[PDB]
Design a protein around this ligand. Structure first.
Ligand SMILES: O=c1ccn([C@H]2C[C@H](O)[C@@H](COP(=O)(O)NP(=O)(O)OP(=O)(O)O)O2)c(=O)[nH]1
Ligand SMILES: O=c1ccn([C@H]2C[C@H](O)[C@@H](COP(=O)(O)NP(=O)(O)OP(=O)(O)O)O2)c(=O)[nH]1
Ligand SMILES: O=c1ccn([C@H]2C[C@H](O)[C@@H](COP(=O)(O)NP(=O)(O)OP(=O)(O)O)O2)c(=O)[nH]1
Ligand SMILES: [Mg+2]
Ligand SMILES: [Mg+2]
Ligand SMILES: [Mg+2]
Lengths: 113, 113, 113
């Protein structure tokens, strides 16, 4: 169970923190959306939330990552929601397949149900 | 016609403001993108804009929400752009199917056409 | 080779900077993801990064843009990653098909591999 602080960025000016799949997974379009496990857990730094997006090279190879929100106070495992677009996609254990981007969490007076 | 201030968040640290469909709608993949009505209208708080994203549990059930930008000065009805991925999807009136996330609107000198 | 400063926004309160395709391109669903060229190059203003999203009217006409991250220090050509959803899509040279949104780049202590 690793916290977000263990993630790395490709370059100093890279916006995304790369996420790996902890399992070897084969995906086909007929399977629809699948939740890939990353081994990384919330919560996030104060006053931030996360967006999970695909890496461009992975998108171009036919694996679509559906953008996901990581809440500031989420303490579960970060999953990547993904679907093979056209072809059979093979995700090997350790392949970096998505990235976490951190964004400011704006306060509002909206009610909390 | 309800303003964004009427939306609610799941938990204090939830980044998204949940959006419902005001109509019962059936969707199939052959239909392609459909615009679902929410009953909620812009504009947004000063110096912010909005992103519309799917809820993860709804994405995993096979309804893809295409991410959308809500401009600061949009005064129309917020719609959710959605497509059934693989299967028939039935959206009941009142189902929360997407979420609005508020983000800072950065000023630049880019021209305004 | 044009910098981001040359882009325009639809209205003063429009969050997105519109991106055009510099080539006439036909797309079908069987083709999967294709990278469209825009003629516009990073890098981005200090302390910002970019998200590339579809325009809503273009999404509703059946061209899906996969959201992409533009890093602060990217100096290559901004491309739009796109797929025809259901039908044949014809992108004419000069059609505005996506938009760049600028967001704050949050600093963290994550390591840089
Ligand atoms: O891609 C994702 C999206 C969400 N998540 C986790 C973290 C986020 O805080 C949590 C809930 O996200 P959403 O609000 O998008 N899902 P939903 O509205 O279905 O669940 P909840 O009712 O708990 O808010 O799911 C992921 O791990 N990966
Ligand atoms: O998912 C969405 C996306 C956009 N919208 C509305 C609000 C946003 O301010 C407005 C215009 O969004 P885009 O700029 O993405 N669309 P487009 O560029 O086609 O229209 P315009 O030329 O008016 O900017 O459409 C939604 O209601 N839901
Ligand atoms: O839609 C996109 C996404 C990315 N890009 C460019 C700019 C961005 O800085 C760069 C790298 O993006 P990602 O980190 O998403 N791709 P990946 O992780 O495959 O490459 P790298 O290993 O270089 O980080 O690709 C685009 O031009 N359009
Ligand atoms: Mg990268
Ligand atoms: Mg939620
Ligand atoms: Mg627009």
């Amino acid at each position: 169970k690793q916290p977000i602080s263990k993630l790395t960025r490709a370059t100093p000016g890279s916006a995304g923190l790369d996420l790996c799949s902890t399992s070897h997974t084969v995906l086909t379009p007929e399977m629809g959306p699948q939740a890939l496990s990353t081994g990384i857990y919330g919560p996030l730094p104060p006053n931030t939330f996360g967006l999970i997006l695909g890496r461009s090279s992975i998108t171009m190879k036919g694996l679509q990552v559906y953008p996901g929100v990581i809440d500031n106070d989420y303490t579960g495992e970060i999953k990547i929601m993904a679907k093979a677009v056209n072809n059979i996609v093979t995700v090997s254990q350790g392949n970096r397949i998505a990235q976490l981007i951190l964004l400011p969490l704006i306060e509002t007076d909206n009610k909390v149900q």
